[PDB]
Design an enzyme around this catalytic site. Structure first.
Site, short mmCIF file in Angstrom:
data_model
loop_
_atom_site.label_atom_id
_atom_site.label_comp_id
_atom_site.label_asym_id
_atom_site.label_seq_id
_atom_site.Cartn_x
_atom_site.Cartn_y
_atom_site.Cartn_z
CD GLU A 62 -63.73 -30.78 31.78
OE1 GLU A 62 -62.59 -30.40 31.36
OE2 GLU A 62 -64.07 -31.84 31.73
CG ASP A 90 -62.54 -26.00 30.62
OD1 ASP A 90 -62.72 -27.04 30.71
OD2 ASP A 90 -61.49 -25.42 30.57
CE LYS A 116 -55.27 -25.01 29.70
NZ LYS A 116 -56.27 -26.06 29.08
O1 LIG Z 1 -57.73 -27.36 31.63
C1 LIG Z 1 -57.86 -28.41 31.24
C2 LIG Z 1 -56.65 -28.86 31.18
C3 LIG Z 1 -56.23 -30.43 30.53
BR1 LIG Z 1 -54.62 -31.32 30.59
N1 LIG Z 1 -57.40 -30.95 29.67
C4 LIG Z 1 -58.93 -30.25 29.66
C5 LIG Z 1 -59.96 -30.88 28.77
N2 LIG Z 1 -61.22 -30.39 28.49
C6 LIG Z 1 -62.02 -31.29 27.93
C7 LIG Z 1 -61.32 -32.47 27.89
N3 LIG Z 1 -59.94 -32.28 28.43
C8 LIG Z 1 -58.91 -28.93 30.23
O2 LIG Z 1 -60.18 -28.17 30.22
MN LIG Z 2 -59.54 -26.23 31.07
MN LIG Z 3 -62.00 -28.73 29.40
#
Ligand SMILES: O=c1cc(Br)[nH]c(C2=NCCN2)c1O
Ligand SMILES: [Mn+2]
Ligand SMILES: [Mn+2]
Length: 180
Positions: A62, A90, A116
């Site tokens: 991330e 992440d 998730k």
């Molecule tokens: O926890 C998360 C919640 C959301 Br909505 N997007 C993402 C994400 N990681 C790479 C690109 N986008 C998260 O890691």
């Molecule tokens: Mn995340």
């Molecule tokens: Mn992410």
């Protein structure tokens, strides 16, 4: 207005710049989508704390641009054989040898965990969900971190929440699913 100001007081410059780039990518305006702005900063900072609580145990994925993030995931896969995820996670945990998805939610931790888990549908990626109420949920109830680190994250999230509450921003923020 007040949300952008709060974001600038409470998150450090690099997290803010990263979150603004994340917004510009999609096409989002941080002065308009202020709850999402705040949510992106909060998720970034939790990911960085998680990773800093590790010889380094974690690789942060991330916060990188997509090219570099997939380059990192690809490198880890080629050097460990770990199956490649379908979505950018992440972090990577070199001790447990698994990717981690980090969730930060204003709703019940189990609700967001189910969201998730249903989304990424990969039995291999570990999931860890933090709320702003000091609550967590993780795959197999394996929280990866020691109590003091998880506690430092919990305190920081609750602090962000109380700072929004004293500015009257919290109710807009928790009623918005934007950023999750
Ligand atoms: O926890 C998360 C919640 C959301 Br909505 N997007 C993402 C994400 N990681 C790479 C690109 N986008 C998260 O890691
Ligand atoms: Mn995340
Ligand atoms: Mn992410």
């Amino acid at each position: 207005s007040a949300m952008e100001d709060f974001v600038r007081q409470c998150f450090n410059p690099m997290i803010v710049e990263l979150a603004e780039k994340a917004m510009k990518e999609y096409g989002e305006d941080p002065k308009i989508e202020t709850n999402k702005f705040a949510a992106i900063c909060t998720h970034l900072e939790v990911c960085f704390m998680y990773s800093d609580f590790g010889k380094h145990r974690f690789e942060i994925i991330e916060g990188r641009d997509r090219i570099m993030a997939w380059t990192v995931v690809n490198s880890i896969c080629n050097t460990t054989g770990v199956e490649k995820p379908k979505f950018l996670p992440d972090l990577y945990d070199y001790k447990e040898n698994r990717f981690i998805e980090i969730g930060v939610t204003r709703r019940e931790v189990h609700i967001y965990y189910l969201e998730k888990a249903n989304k990424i549908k990969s039995e291999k990626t570990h999931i860890h969900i933090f709320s702003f109420t000091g609550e967590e949920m993780a795959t197999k109830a394996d929280y990866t971190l020691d109590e003091e680190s998880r506690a430092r994250i919990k305190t920081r999230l609750f602090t962000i929440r109380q700072e929004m509450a004293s500015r009257s921003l919290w109710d807009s923020f928790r009623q918005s699913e934007r950023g999750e």
